[PDB]
Amino acid sequence: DYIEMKVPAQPEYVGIIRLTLSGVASRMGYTYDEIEDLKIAVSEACTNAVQHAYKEDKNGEVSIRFGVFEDRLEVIVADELSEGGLGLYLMETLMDEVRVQNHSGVTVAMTKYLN
Template sequence: MREEIEIRLPAEPDQLSLLRTVAGAIAMRADFDLDAIADLKIAVDEACSMLIMQAAKGAVLRCTFGTDEDGIVVQSEVATDGNEPLDDTAFGWHVLSTLTDESSWTRSEAGVCLRLSLQRKVNNS
């Protein structure tokens, strides 16, 4: 069964600790191992930091965490003033690509949307 949690908060750096905490709690509740929980927390922090840097003044950062038997999908979106793309050649993007199974971004009418997924690892032992 798919569950989804959405959080909306000011697109400000001081909100990142709350997002890390929520990401960790969701991954723990979804029965991910400690390494995967830590990876997700770092990835959410990095992704939301990228979005906050591009956010329009007074923008709201919207993060949706979806879980199912396959894993966790995090979608974060923020309104921006311009049409500047996310730099997917930067070190931060490399971090996202390393810590997640999938990371992508798209431009919407209002701003930028970033999507991350972390698949559940199958234990064959």
């Protein structure tokens, strides 16, 4: 199953994604800690997109896709580049897989497995 979101690339809306995310992550039955980590990792990917819109002074939009599978959650955040930060460290430590690719703004594809 695939849930898709599109929000304006403004900071008000990252908190919105965390809700939607905790929604999906609960329905899939992750832990509290597992949901609390997923919330951090997804905000981090969204924050790079929001920040990258300040520098360009664009009004941009973030695209977020939750791919809910039998064994894992896949989250894709795209921003229709990468200079590694503290935030990117957090996504990798907390998640099972992270894959970054530009130049499509950037698109971050991260995965977490059910335990």
